[PDB]
Amino acid sequence: LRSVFVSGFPRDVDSAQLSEYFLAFGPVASVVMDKDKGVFAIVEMGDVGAREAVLSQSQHSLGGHRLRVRPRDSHQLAKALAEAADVGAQMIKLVGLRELSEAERQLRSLVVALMQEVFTEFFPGCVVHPFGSSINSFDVHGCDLDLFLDLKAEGAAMLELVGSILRGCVPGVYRVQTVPSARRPVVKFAHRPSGLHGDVSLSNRLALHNSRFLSLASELDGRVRPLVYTLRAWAQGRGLSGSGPLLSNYALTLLVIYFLQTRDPPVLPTVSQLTQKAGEGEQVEVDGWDCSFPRDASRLEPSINVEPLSSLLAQFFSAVSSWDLRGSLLSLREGQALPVAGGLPSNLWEGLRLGPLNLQDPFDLSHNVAANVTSRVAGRLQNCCRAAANYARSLQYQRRSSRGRDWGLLPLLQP
Ligand SMILES: [Mg+2]
Ligand SMILES: [Mg+2]
């Protein structure tokens, strides 16, 4: 597909002139005007890279006329987002569509209850804590159900025992696979009646609190869920968020939250500030790290930041693209970037893994959630952010479309 659809050039303009214009971007193979009609025309470039170079620039003009050059479940999403009022309404609608329905959530709680009632007989006093995607209120349709069982060879034996229990005892669950061989040992399971799948971890415990923190963030400000959902969909769109060297959903969420912490008025407070507001009985530590923070966001002061969702999204793209990733450790606790060269963040907090992208976990401070991210992924993240930022400054992002044209979020959510 080296050919591009080009329309909008003035009446009585030569195809040789279009050829001459597109000649700047590279070799032009052919230019064919619409024969019986007029208006648009098709331009085939010599190189596919030249075609990508033409599509790369959103600003085209000839003879004083601006040119439109375009290459030439999900459909429900696009249609619904096209029906919205503006960018903000689009983001909120995206949240409403992707988020779990109440039936799904209560179904999840029911399944958790089943698992608990089965496990309690084998391990008296054991507690099954749902964590991650389900309880952090960033949940999406068909997301994993991750359970933590609260009670390295003995760990493997115990893991196999849990696998056996899931296999032969609790009714309805199939696809049981024990995985001791991973950084965090886990037992994969699938419950058939509820149509759910997930992982059971022996000790993930710290992560549980992380989830809670995330939830609190969503309760602290109303823009958090739209921003995080939208940026999740976007990162998954550009191939940024993911499994391998790609960013994890948790790391991305942490990045968005950090961005919200770094705004001129803060949208979210720093984790340290939350720890200060914890209070008696809410004090909790895990592996030496302080995990404490308020139960409800009601007794916490609101955000004086008046920035709308659109401006916050554009500011996210711009700021993330503008940051220095390799030389900075992004801190959620202090809500700011701590310089790597000088300040030696690796001295205190021993075991901290630095690199292309450094993002510090709000509780365990020796943990870089972005440590897995390679140079290519980081650079491509900043590049995509620069792109999206330049797009957010256009009229296509800011305003709606009269009929049928993709506007606002829709170009950002496409592959
Ligand atoms: Mg019973
Ligand atoms: Mg999973």
Author numbering: 55 to 126, 145 to 223, 334 to 597
Source paper text:
After transcription, the 3′-end is oligo-uridylylated by a terminal uridylyltransferase, TUT1 (TUTase6)910, one of the members of the non-canonical nucleotidyltransferases. TUT1 is composed of N-terminal Zn-finger, RRM, palm, fingers and KA-1 domains. The C-terminal region of TUT1 is a previously unidentified RNA-binding domain, and it was named the KA-1 domain. Thus, the present structural and biochemical studies have demonstrated that TUT1 acts as a U6 snRNA-specific terminal uridylyltransferase.
The crystal of TUT1 lacking the N-terminal Zn-finger, PRR and C-terminal region (TUT1_ΔC) was also obtained (form-IV). The crystal belongs to the space group P43212. The structure was modelled and refined to an R factor of 20.3% (Rfree of 24.2%) up to 3.2 Å resolution. In the form-IV TUT1_ΔC structure, the N-terminal domain adopts a typical RRM fold, with four anti-parallel β-sheets stacked onto two α-helices. A comparison of the structures of the N-terminal RRM of TUT1 and the U2AF65 RRM1 suggested that the conserved aromatic or hydrophobic resides (Phe59, Phe94 and Ile96) on the β-strands would be involved in single-stranded RNA binding. The linker region (residues 127–144), bridging the RRM and the fingers, was disordered and the electron density was not observed. Since the RRM does not interact with other domains in TUT1_ΔC in the crystal structure, the N-terminal RRM would be mobile in the substrate RNA-free form of TUT1. The N-terminal RRM is mobile relative to the catalytic core domains, and the C-terminal domain KA-1 domain rotates relative to the catalytic core domains.
